[PDB]
Write an enzyme that holds these catalytic residues in place. Structure first.
Site, mmCIF file in Angstrom:
data_model
loop_
_atom_site.group_PDB
_atom_site.id
_atom_site.type_symbol
_atom_site.label_atom_id
_atom_site.label_comp_id
_atom_site.label_asym_id
_atom_site.label_seq_id
_atom_site.Cartn_x
_atom_site.Cartn_y
_atom_site.Cartn_z
ATOM 1 N N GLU C 160 0.715 -1.023 0.189
ATOM 2 C CA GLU C 160 0.020 -0.068 -0.053
ATOM 3 C C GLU C 160 0.797 1.133 0.014
ATOM 4 O OE1 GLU C 160 -3.657 -0.369 -0.323
ATOM 5 O OE2 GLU C 160 -2.681 1.467 -1.150
ATOM 6 N N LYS C 219 8.604 -1.118 -2.356
ATOM 7 C CA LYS C 219 7.838 -0.566 -1.139
ATOM 8 C C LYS C 219 8.744 0.416 -0.328
ATOM 9 C CE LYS C 219 4.740 1.192 1.792
ATOM 10 N NZ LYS C 219 4.300 2.496 1.560
ATOM 11 N N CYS C 275 6.554 6.025 9.474
ATOM 12 C CA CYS C 275 6.935 5.462 8.163
ATOM 13 C C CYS C 275 8.488 5.655 7.669
ATOM 14 C CB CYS C 275 5.944 5.646 7.090
ATOM 15 S SG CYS C 275 4.390 5.512 7.398
#
EC number: 1.1.1.22
Lengths: 461, 463, 460
Positions: C160, C219, C275
């Site tokens: 995602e 990612k 993140c």
């Protein structure tokens, strides 16, 4: 059970020549053909003067040459006819590029492999005899696979040599063990067994060890490193003996009487030499670096660092004992070969000790009973040799007017010199630096004559 | 206010020549004179064969030369007459002394500044076009102040060039932005506007950014550093791809589809080259050390270390795949220019790959469609080693004949169209292709069924 | 093969919103979000959702109970599903090998074991959460070792990329959808089945299919590339301060190059959030474990530069206050890691505050959205009791202060009454702008009497 009837050995050096001579000597029904691109060597092998000296080799070669032992420059036909091809070419250390000074130079092995597959049909066993890096057999297999032909079936084995120069024939006729590595497939085992059957003509089955290919290649490197480590370990103890008043020969004797350690390779020295020990340990270190094993690499690098320290430490003792200056001082160097009873100087400790004293401007007078004048000049050369190096014809001329006598090689005759005569003509104080413990037991007499004598692993007194 | 009618450009290289040609082309009422001490260059610029190759440049130059564009060695009079003087001399990396290998060499800029004030009267705008370290303008202003005359008024601006090699004309006619830095004084602003009005003859006002002098100088270094970093970053990922089984082209596409990152300058390669990226990054690094910013210095130094690592690692892959020995092996080097569609070899990755293989004693056969043979010999010389180990081939098939490996170091389109079936038959086996540019992507299935073992940047080796 | 039933294990900020959009866009697909956390599952079924995203409350209410379901029955959801999303957390290890850098995989492995225990026949199993590269090989090994007759579990990667604050917009109009799978016929069949779900609202040209490892690595790399842009422009801000350049001018000039682009070029006291740092450290650890030290130290610079930007900012405050802040009142304006959120994770304000606490400063912290208890927790290991006050309004924080430190770019800080603030501060009064929020106000603040210092601008 496949029987090998024809053998071809590519490479006529100190590995291939004696081994293939003994195989022929022990296996009358096997034809043994030694081939090499160097025409001079092949002619020398067929001449009354063999290109390498080993006791018993001249006799062995003369009993088989012309019956089942053959030396030829016809590499192509020897490969074509052979059931078994030995790869016995040189693997010098790279002097250039990646791994300079440590990695093995593989160019002769790869060209040899390409020559074999170009000249082969049907079934053959191809055996690595020269010291190769681990996984070499995978490369040789890939060259064979990429150049395959109908009906071509080349089996690759590893079969290292463990002979020490000077005792090659005795070691080949009565080996501690024979090591043969091959794939653990049915084809690999048939090939391994076929080679075992050759050695079983004179080697008891209990002394023939079969392993996989990679174990066999690594065993050769590991064995020499373990031996060199014994010497570096006792040499490290000699420095501690000098510092404490212990005596390294007493300590080495006490250690060696433990039967789990054994009493061999425990003689302290100014450092080990020869064309094998340093080369193989450095090859092992490089392999570890390449495989991301830096802990193992630095573990084995210590064997070499200790050897380098033992030499440099001995040269510094000489300089320090001679009042911290040796410029223009005459110094006798007794012994230049890397060990006694040989002319071989390769990685001789005498070379490094000499260079250290030349770097101080000492006038070296070098005597060795077997090494020729020309080789000593080459070993110390790149002009400095002209200014500083004299090669003496007898030991007494080397000692005439000297400040110090430096014993670098354990020749038996150095024990027997007339040291009373030597002392009279040396400058005073006169020093003896014994780098081999050959003057053990003579220290009391040499001191009363007037020498100051210093030796490895014994406190100065 | 002030209208520039005569422009003098000192320096006839990549910085000065094309920009002043385009200015003349777009501003028929402005007389543009490019001057240089190198008499060979001035003649070449005045000849039908130009000293640098850029598509469209010849057409631009031939449309103005002799009309309002001139190339001359008369530096002094071109300065005297000019309303605007561009400083466009080179700033190579110092090869000696303090900052050797990293600092910019400023001797040509300073001599240029001294020449200008010596030959100037009245009002002139002096503009730094060449890549300079930050605060260069302060040094130039001090030279001018110390050598002033009655009624002398020299305004110093910064106006760096951002053209990319290969698309110089398109970028000058349609720039992403034009950058002009000057003092935040009334006189500095008048000079900034006077330069803006020149560019406004063909550049929209929204694309002209005006900043202070120091921001403009730094922006040039930083932008070049950011571009090189994108390449070093995707190259670092390529080594991770080789170790994991990811594919760097798939990863670069996925990353570049984030519109905040964008999809440009994400092509993994054997390493960036050319006369500007490394030079400009090292200048930024040296600047940081001199200002006691060692953390910033080591941050940008990593862009260069990664580029050096990418080349050394590619050469080590070749040697390892070739059974850890290339001594006396014939190896084809396809591509020597630092990028395709040029003869320029400056800081070409092929030089470094070639030298790493030469250090092993490989027999290199080098083919490049545009680099001349003598330049390849010069780039690989210090010589004797070049004589022993280097052959320059007349075509790629000759380079590959009897070769163990083909190494593609420059992304020339023709290497995609070679007859690899013919090449394979005459190569030694196993035959290797090392694609340092991903030019053979999509041909792997075809090349493998022919019999090649093919290895490429950012792809795990097939077993 | 058509996916008809979807099960998503993990009901966090990743699984919940993504599966709600799938349900909203695919009426014929039954979508079940499952989680062992019973508090969360009820919140999803309540009128107050456990996470706030604009448009999320609207989307969930259009599907919940129709084809979108939230349940704690993980086992039956697995048994019935054609496609299983793995969307559990992978926090950083705080212990043992790779402490502080590697991901803790215990939840993923446990999730893998639960799936294979409850599966028969053909299913597609998809990694949605951020995993280390080669994670899929570990999941495949667990599946193979626990296999049953005719079991066929295909493992895919589908990371995602939504950004906090715009999650729903990003899911309805993604820059790209990334699907990794095996390059075998069974892998390609499973990949095409997942593409068909997304093709209900995502154009084909924006759906990228790759191999499994590329998808996992993409990612991590993408977030590392973004973090690097911030660290690169922050490194330039230190150089601007040393030279007289202005980092906003430089960033504008840089960002107008269309090959660089103009996004993520805002210099700051340091990047934050749950993140960026976590993914860059994971990449560095991955490189060390693969014997790639050159690559490892390359990406480590992104973090070292971020740490340096914060430490340098705190040292400027201390040096400007005459090298002592013991017992000095200092106002901290902004504690969230960015404006318009209550999230404080890896907020630069935490680090700036702790540096000032190590000097013995009396900090008065104001943030319009972060709750009091969260600030106390973030600053704790007694030192907080002695030195930290959490203020109700910004003027109280500034009253009697020596310095105002703006650490978070809340819009309201631009609008404060700085004339009023100046009168009650001790003199000389400092403003340290760590976000460039006061640009354009420097002359007005200076004439009032402030000494104003900001990132990327030389001191006046």
């Amino acid at each position: 059970m496949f029987e090998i009837k024809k053998i071809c050995c590519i490479g006529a050096g100190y590995v291939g020549g004696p081994t293939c001579s003994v195989i022929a000597h022990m296996c009358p029904e096997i034809r043994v053909t030694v081939v090499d691109v160097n025409e001079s060597r092949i002619n020398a092998w067929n001449s009354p003067t063999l290109p390498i000296y080993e006791p018993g080799l001249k006799e062995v070669v003369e009993s088989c040459r012309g019956k089942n032992l053959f030396f030829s420059t016809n590499i192509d036909d020897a490969i074509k006819e052979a059931d078994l091809v030995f790869i016995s070419v040189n693997t010098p250390t790279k002097t250039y590029g990646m791994g300079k000074g440590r990695a093995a130079d593989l160019k002769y092995i790869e060209a040899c492999a390409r020559r074999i597959v170009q000249n082969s049909n049907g079934y053959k066993i191809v055996t690595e005899k020269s010291t190769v890096p681990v996984r070499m057999a995978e490369s040789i297999r890939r060259i064979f696979d990429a150049n395959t032909k109908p009906n071509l079936n080349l089996q690759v084995l590893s079969n290292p040599e463990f002979l020490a120069e000077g005792t090659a024939i005795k070691d080949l006729k009565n080996p501690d063990r024979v090591l043969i590595g091959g794939d653990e497939t049915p084809e690999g085992q048939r090939a391994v067994q076929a080679l075992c059957a050759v050695y079983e003509h004179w080697v008891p089955r209990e002394k023939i060890l079969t392993t996989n290919t990679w174990s066999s290649e690594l065993s050769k490197l590991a064995a020499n490193a373990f031996l060199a480590q014994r010497i570096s370990s006792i040499n490290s103890i000699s420095a501690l003996c000098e510092a404490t008043g212990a005596d390294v020969e007493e300590v080495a004797t006490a250690i060696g009487m433990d039967q789990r350690i054994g009493n061999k390779f425990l003689k302290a020295s100014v450092g080990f030499g020869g064309s094998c020990f340093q080369k193989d340990v450095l090859n092992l270190v490089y392999l570890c670096e390449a495989l991301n094993l830096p802990e193992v690499a630095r573990y084995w690098q210590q064997v070499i660092d200790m050897n380098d320290y033992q030499r440099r430490r001995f040269a510094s003792r000489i300089i320090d004992s001679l009042f911290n200056t040796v410029t223009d001082k005459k110094i006798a160097i007794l012994g230049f070969a890397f060990k006694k009873d040989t002319g071989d100087t390769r990685e001789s400790s005498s070379i490094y000790i000499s260079k250290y004293l030349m770097d101080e401007g000492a006038h070296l007078h070098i005597y060795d009973p077997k090494v020729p004048r020309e080789q000593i000049v080459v070993d110390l050369s790149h002009d400095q040799v002209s200014r500083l190096v004299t090669i003496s014809k007898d030991p007494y001329e080397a000692c005439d007017g000297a400040h110090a006598v430096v014993i670098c090689t354990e020749w038996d005759m150095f024990k027997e010199l007339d040291y009373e005569r030597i002392h009279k003509k040396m400058l005073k104080p006169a020093f003896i630096f014994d780098g081999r413990r050959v003057l053990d037991g003579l220290h009391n007499e040499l001191q009363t004559i007037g020498f100051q004598i210093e030796t490895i692993g014994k406190k100065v007194s």
